[PDB]
From Swiss-Prot, chain A:
Keyword Glycosyltransferase found: no
Protein name per the record: Large ribosomal subunit protein uL18
Quaternary context: Part of the 50S ribosomal subunit; part of the 5S rRNA/L5/L18/L25 subcomplex. Contacts the 5S and 23S rRNAs.
Species: Escherichia coli (strain K12)
HAMAP family in the record: Ribosomal_uL18_B
Recorded name of the encoding gene: rplR
Keyword Kinase assigned: no
Domain notes: The basic N-terminus is not necessary for binding to 5S rRNA. It is however required for cooperative binding of L5 and L18 to 5S rRNA as well as for binding of the 5S rRNA/L5/L18 complex to the 23S rRNA.
GO biological process: cytoplasmic translation
Swiss-Prot record, chain B:
Gene that specifies this protein: rplE
Domain of life per record: Bacteria
Keywords of this entry: Acetylation, Ribonucleoprotein, Ribosomal protein, RNA-binding, rRNA-binding, tRNA-binding
Protein family (similarity comment): Belongs to the universal ribosomal protein uL5 family.
Known role: This is one of the proteins that bind and probably mediate the attachment of the 5S RNA into the large ribosomal subunit, where it forms part of the central protuberance. Its 5S rRNA binding is significantly enhanced in the presence of L18.
Organism name: Escherichia coli (strain K12)
Record protein name field: Large ribosomal subunit protein uL5
Pfam families according to UniProt: Ribosomal_L5 (PF00281), Ribosomal_L5_C (PF00673)
Record text on subunit structure and interactions: Part of the 50S ribosomal subunit; part of the 5S rRNA/L5/L18/L25 subcomplex. Contacts the 5S rRNA; cross-links to the P site tRNA. Forms a bridge to the 30S subunit in the 70S ribosome, contacting protein S13 and S19.
Entry keyword Disulfide bond: no
GO cellular component: cytoplasm; cytosol; cytosolic large ribosomal subunit
GO molecular function terms listed in the Swiss-Prot or TrEMBL record: 5S rRNA binding; RNA binding; structural constituent of ribosome; tRNA binding
General remark: Identified as a multicopy suppressor of the slow growth phenotype of an rsgA (yjeQ) deletion mutant.
List of residues that carry N6-acetyllysine: K2
From Swiss-Prot, chain D:
Gene Ontology, cellular component aspect: cytoplasm; cytosolic large ribosomal subunit
Post-translation changes: Is hydroxylated on Arg-81 by RoxA. The modification is nearly suppressed when E.coli is grown in anoxia.
Residue numbers of N-methylmethionine PTMs: M1
Organism from which the protein derives: Escherichia coli (strain K12)
HAMAP family reported in the protein's UniProt record: Ribosomal_uL16
Family the entry assigns: Belongs to the universal ribosomal protein uL16 family.
The protein's name: Large ribosomal subunit protein uL16
Subunit structure: Part of the 50S ribosomal subunit. Cross-links to the A and P site tRNAs. Interacts with assembly factor DarP(YjgA).
Swiss-Prot record, chain E:
GO cellular component: cytoplasm; cytosolic large ribosomal subunit
The protein, known as: Large ribosomal subunit protein bL27
HAMAP family tied to this protein: Ribosomal_bL27
PANTHER family the UniProt entry points to: LARGE RIBOSOMAL SUBUNIT PROTEIN BL27M, RIBOSOMAL PROTEIN L27
GO MF terms, alphabetically ordered: ribosome binding; rRNA binding; structural constituent of ribosome; tRNA binding
Native source organism of the sequence: Escherichia coli (strain K12)
Gene from which this protein is expressed: rpmA
Gene3D superfamilies: 2.40.50.100
Assembly: Part of the 50S ribosomal subunit. Cross-links to the 23S rRNA. Cross-links to the A and P site tRNAs.
Keyword terms: Ribonucleoprotein, Ribosomal protein, RNA-binding, rRNA-binding, tRNA-binding
A Pfam family that the UniProt record links to this protein: Ribosomal_L27
NCBIfam families listed in its UniProt record: L27
Similarity section: Belongs to the bacterial ribosomal protein bL27 family.
InterPro entries assigned to the protein according to its UniProt record, in alphabetical order: Ribosomal_bL27, Ribosomal_bL27_CS
RNA sequence: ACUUACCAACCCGAUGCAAACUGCGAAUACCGGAGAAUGUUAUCACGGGAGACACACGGCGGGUGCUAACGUCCGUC
RNA sequence: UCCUCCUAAAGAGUAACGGAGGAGCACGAAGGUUGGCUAAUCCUGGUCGGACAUCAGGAGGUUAGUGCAAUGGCAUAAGCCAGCUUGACUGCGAGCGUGACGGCGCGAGCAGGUGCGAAAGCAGGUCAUAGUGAUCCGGUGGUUCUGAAUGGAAGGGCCAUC
RNA sequence: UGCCUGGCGGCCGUAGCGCGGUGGUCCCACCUGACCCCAUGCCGAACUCAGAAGUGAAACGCCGUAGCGCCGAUGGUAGUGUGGGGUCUCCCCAUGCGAGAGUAGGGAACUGCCAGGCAU
């Protein structure tokens, strides 16, 4: 299995469970250069809020978009953006990535900024 | 690391003009070097495996994985999960350091050496060879060896063909016919 | 057939016990497991003894 | 004499023999012998008929047998009462439905094939008829 | 050697069909494996019994890339 | 090491067979909702009284037997 | 006696000295959870090494695997590994299935307490379906019950277990 | 609004495979480095971290293409409920239902949310 098909397999179980639970998930996507965060509604097809390093307002304050400091910036931003829209309780979907390093920097910052999970 | 430099500084260049590749990312690369010992008779003397393992460890410079019987087969009287060999997968710095030791001094110390075969390619650019005696590696202390023992070498490549795989080794001055 | 009944006894003062089985050949030592003691209403260490 | 070399199971329900045949065209040879009636062909019958048609052509040309006796038939012997287990397998039949091409042939003149198939048909317990290859 | 044996029938099968209104907890199908899978408001027991987790109507569907069978429960 | 008019699995093309085969699949039957007409409640519950638990043939679908039996065993009328 | 398949007529059930097999156990991990992983078979190359051991690539795509019969499941694996572990928890249970009955099964949720996980969550044994013996009598431990004038005790009850 | 890309879903092969072509500013990918976080029953392959010298070779995406997969009528055929009938191991008639395979043919998916790059 190639890296990607392998990760999607790694992600399927947790997503079905969250789907079953009807949870609003904070979905993360990581790349060597960029990291992305999306709060998606239980229907699985609507993005309520989002943040990432490909948007200039965020990458502008960052040294390198593909590291842990950046991950902390993205996480903090989704949280804020999300809280301002009344969104508070979500579930973390690490999307087949280890709960670690960058993903965990993003998660920790998102919690820091009041997002509940 | 010296032979990784020689790959970059010298080999890439040679193969690009040899096969007229459009992208340098087509030039064949040594991907990994895998050493193996089919021990096989550790089933009677478990210690034969330990000494094979330690032979590889000292040859490769990294802890060997000991490989189990994938499948019982009554012909060699082996049950599934029986330890029956040991292996080491070399990459990066270690593979290159070994690759040189192999060419620069191990292989030359084969008895009445006349070169290695150039037809031992699998049909997709990967090369395989055996050594009969592990004492050709100077990491093995001739006085201490419990026993002379042999060893598989396979050089896995990103060449798609044997013609390409051969140019890659040839460019390192790999000894052939 | 060879598998014998044993009782795990509460390490608290209570005389509460769980009952289970054991292969005494392959596993000669004393089975020891945290379990819930309904008399002190807490999880406590339980230790094999004879049935 | 035809027989399955091995089978999953030794014995078989009686079952029934309704329907029209599959394999109703001459698909290999030039001529065919076709069942018009319904019934069971035993391995010995199939053999007797194969011999007859093969004498008739002096082992010239080529012959195909489209049927295969894969149904085991059991029987209870004399002086045994009912029950006490299903009988023992004694022989093998092919189930025949109207329309099955039984044998095919080619490499001989039509006149000789009709004769050979005539001799063979006299060995069979079901009425048959002579058929020919057809474009489409 | 000798035959002559069989086991008691286990009465597996669908207990409530499409459209049927059931109370939560009601067994909808007894099965040996997951021929049917648990969908929304339907649970899977240890013997792969599918049961209602909510009051409502039984609903069979076919879903996903493997064309699998799912039983769910619709509020009514 | 080389070869023989021998046998040859797998694979490709063509042709059939299966109660314990299915990449297909009815008619019916069965479960559930709603509605009219009809039907001496034909329904369910509790309670008083039982009898019965040797079945037969015929039709259809089958196992067994020989698609034998006024045979034998189930299903259904 | 029990389990699996067919007969069994596309819901359940359905007989014969009908056709085929299996159970009367195993496991403190082969249980729980988190995290990860992915077979068979064939072709080519490779010391000893052979049709078949272990190594590499390619085809293949679950035909493998599942402690064990068969059938149905299984990739989000139910298959395979490791870390931490004892939910193989105690009290209950809306609502159901299956039984003439005795019974047997499935079960979300509630209270207490626990393991694993960052968290959502998962765990009341094992992919599921065999692996079993009513009552009586008696043994062992526990006990706010009983205790033949009264206080005890014996014996009885109740709970656990043999 | 238009093209391009990434993410998350709907749908579950008319949607897949193959063959040919094609893309790197952006995105994606390979990639670079690895003491360290973290990892390998061996291996920085994978997981992971710090990056940006190189390349779209592979992968991925897009466009093309009926070798295959897939979908697929009409008509006939098979079966079958009810009623009737025959030469009753099997069939026929009336009525209703009506496959499977094959044939013609279709087919190189369709679609929503958010974000990024480019252009008018
Ligand atoms: Mg009554
Ligand atoms: Mg009686
Ligand atoms: Mg009777
Ligand atoms: Mg009767
Ligand atoms: Mg009679
Ligand atoms: Mg049935
Ligand atoms: Mg029926
Ligand atoms: Mg297991
Ligand atoms: Mg997991
Ligand atoms: Mg070989
Ligand atoms: Mg915790
Ligand atoms: Mg006493
Ligand atoms: Mg007294
Ligand atoms: Mg007294
Ligand atoms: Mg890398
Ligand atoms: Mg390319
Ligand atoms: Mg066309
Ligand atoms: Mg129609
Ligand atoms: Mg249809
Ligand atoms: Mg059709
Ligand atoms: Mg078709
Ligand atoms: Mg936009």
């Amino acid at each position: 299995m190639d890296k990607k098909s392998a990760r999607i397999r790694r992600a399927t179980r947790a997503r079905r469970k969250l789907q079953e639970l009807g949870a609003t998930r904070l979905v993360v996507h990581r790349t060597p250069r960029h990291i992305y965060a999306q709060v998606i509604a239980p229907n699985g097809s609507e993005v309520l809020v989002a943040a990432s390093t490909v948007e200039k307002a965020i990458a502008e304050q960052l040294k390198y978009t593909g590291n842990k400091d950046a991950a902390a910036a993205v996480g903090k931003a989704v949280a804020e953006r999300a809280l301002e829209k009344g969104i508070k309780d979500v579930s973390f979907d690490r999307s087949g990535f280890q709960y670690h390093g960058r993903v965990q920097a993003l998660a920790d910052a998102a919690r820091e900024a009041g997002l509940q999970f | 690391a010296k032979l990784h430099d020689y790959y970059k500084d010298e080999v890439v260049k040679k193969l690009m003009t040899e096969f007229n590749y459009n992208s340098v990312m087509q030039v064949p690369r040594v991907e990994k070097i895998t050493l193996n010992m089919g021990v096989g008779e550790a089933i009677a003397d478990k210690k034969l495996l330990d000494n094979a393992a330690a032979d590889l460890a000292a040859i490769s410079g990294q802890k060997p994985l000991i490989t189990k019987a994938r499948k019982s087969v009554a012909g060699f009287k082996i049950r599934q999960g029986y330890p029956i060999g040991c292996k080491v997968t070399l990459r990066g710095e270690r593979m290159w350091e070994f690759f040189e030791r192999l060419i620069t001094i191990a292989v030359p110390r084969i008895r009445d050496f006349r070169g290695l075969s150039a037809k031992s390619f699998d049909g997709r650019g990967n090369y395989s060879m055996g050594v009969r005696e592990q004492i050709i590696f100077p990491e093995i202390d001739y006085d201490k060896v419990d026993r002379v023992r042999g060893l598989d070498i396979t050089i896995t490549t990103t060449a798609k063909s044997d013609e390409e795989g051969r140019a890659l080794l040839a460019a390192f001055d790999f000894p052939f016919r | 057939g060879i598998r014998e009944k044993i009782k795990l006894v509460s390490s608290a003062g209570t005389g509460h016990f769980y009952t289970t089985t054991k292969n005494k050949r392959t596993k000669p030592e004393k089975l020891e497991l945290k379990k819930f003691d309904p008399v002190v209403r807490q999880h406590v260490i339980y230790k094999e003894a004879k049935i | 004499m035809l027989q399955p070399k091995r089978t999953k199971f030794r014995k078989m329900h009686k079952g029934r023999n309704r329907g029209l045949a599959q394999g109703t065209d001459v698909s290999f040879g030039s001529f065919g012998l076709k069942a018009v009636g319904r019934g069971r062909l035993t391995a010995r019958q199939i053999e007797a008929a194969r011999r007859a048609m093969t004498r008739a052509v002096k082992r010239q040309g080529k012959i195909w047998i489209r049927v295969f006796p894969d149904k085991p038939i059991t029987e209870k012997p004399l002086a045994v009462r009912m029950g006490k287990g299903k009988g023992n397998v004694e022989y093998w039949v092919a189930l025949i439905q109207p329309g099955k091409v039984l044998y095919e042939m080619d490499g001989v003149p039509e006149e000789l094939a009709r004769e050979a198939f005539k001799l063979a048909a006299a060995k069979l317990p079901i009425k048959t008829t002579f058929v020919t290859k057809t474009v489409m | 050697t000798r035959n002559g044996r069989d086991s008691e029938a286990k009465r597996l099968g669908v207990k409530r069909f499409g459209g049927e209104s059931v109370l939560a907890g009601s067994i909808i199908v007894r099965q040996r494996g997951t021929k049917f899978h648990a969908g929304a408001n339907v649970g899977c027991g240890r013997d792969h019994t599918l049961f209602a987790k909510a009051d409502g109507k039984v609903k069979f569907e076919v879903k996903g890339p493997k064309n699998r069978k799912f039983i769910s429960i619709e509020a009514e």
